[PDB]
Amino acid sequence: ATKSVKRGVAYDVASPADLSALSTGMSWWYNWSPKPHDRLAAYDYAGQYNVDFVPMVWNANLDDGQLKLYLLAHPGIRYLLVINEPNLVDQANMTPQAAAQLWPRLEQISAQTGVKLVGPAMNWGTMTGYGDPVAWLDAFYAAYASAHQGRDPQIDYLAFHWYDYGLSSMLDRLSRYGKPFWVTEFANWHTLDDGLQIDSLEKQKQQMAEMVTMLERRSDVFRYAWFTGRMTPDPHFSSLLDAEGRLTELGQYYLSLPYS
Numbered sequence: 096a097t098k099s100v101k102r103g104v105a106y107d108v109a110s111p112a113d114l115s116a117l118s119t120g121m122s123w124w125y126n127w128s129p130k131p132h133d134r135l136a137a138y139d140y141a142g143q144y145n146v147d148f149v150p151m152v153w154n155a156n157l158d159d160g161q162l163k164l165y166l167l168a169h170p171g172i173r174y175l176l177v178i179n180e181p182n183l184v185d186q187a188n189m190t191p192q193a194a195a196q197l198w199p200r201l202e203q204i205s206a207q208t209g210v211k212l213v214g215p216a217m218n219w220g221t222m223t224g225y226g227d228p229v230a231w232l233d234a235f236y237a238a239y240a241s242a243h244q245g246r247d248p249q250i251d252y253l254a255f256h257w258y259d260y261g262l263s264s265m266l267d268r269l270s271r272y273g274k275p276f277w278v279t280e281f282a283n284w285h286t287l288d289d290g291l292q293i294d295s296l297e298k299q300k301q302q303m304a305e306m307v308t309m310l311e312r313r314s315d316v317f318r319y320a321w322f323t324g325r326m327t328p329d330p331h332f333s334s335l336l337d338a339e340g341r342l343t344e345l346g347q348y349y350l351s352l353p354y355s
């Protein structure tokens with residue numbers, strides 16, 4: 096089937112039956128880790144389902160040799176997601192200096208394997224002083240440049256996560272770095288009782304269609320990934336899958352939305 100190169104899912108796909116269901120409309124997935132779920136090891140998903148897996152270095156706890164070996168043995172992998180929400184204490188929780196210290200290892204992987212670096216994956220944060228992703232990125236750039244005679248860190252794409260209204264405004268703010276984006280988690284989880292709360296499937300479908308239209312349209316958005324395959328409880332009706340190998344109404348909707 097012809098489908099959007101952009102359209103992904105943020106979910107540890109484990110079942111081949113879940114790929115059948117998703118592959119109609121989904122080009123790619125990731126699972127916040129350097130390798131796909133073990134269940135998929137002896138399945139040619141690239142060839143049968145026309146889906147690719149994008150590996151991720153979640154924080155500085157990195158087996159460089161093992162990742163390099165995997166990437167070199169899988170030359171069709173062209174992108175490496177790096178650093179999952181460093182400015183969130185409940186995620187990578189990396190200071191700007193800690194991320195700058197890791198970065199040369201990631202540049203060496205890029206130089207050795209050809210992969211482009213997609214990250215850090217930013218959000219509005221909880222790390223002291225670094226709620227604003229612009230503050231965190233500015234400090235990271237300054238830390239890296241300090242340690243490398245003024246050179247900026249290699250960033251092929253920035254990544255972004257967003258669970259509210261205003262995702263286009265956040266991309267506009269972050270366009271100050273002059274880098275294109277992957278939006279590697281999104282949904283609308285607004286909860287406050289202000290009229291905008293997403294408390295029905297109809298309202299999540301409405302926001303999914305609005306956000307997908309905008310992401311497909313933007314020339315500086317290469318890829319996006321919906322959160323998520325399955326979750327429970329699911330108060331904002333974010334799940335694309337139900338039983339093994341079965342789409343929800345939202346899943347069927349997502350995979351059939353138009354694209355660029």
Ligand SMILES: OC[C@H]1O[C@@H](O[C@@H]2[C@@H](O)[C@H](O[C@@H]3[C@@H](O)[C@H](O)O[C@H](CO)[C@H]3O)O[C@H](CO)[C@H]2O)[C@H](O)[C@@H](O)[C@@H]1O
Pocket residue numbers: 126127128153154156179186
């Ligand atoms: O790599 C070692 C590193 O692993 C860390 O554990 C992470 C998980 O926290 C992460 O979990 C994902 C979340 O980041 C994301 O928000 O939601 C998804 C879906 O629920 C989670 O799977 O998954 C990755 C990959 O499996 C794990 O690396 C430990 O926190 C950390 O201390 C350790 O250094």
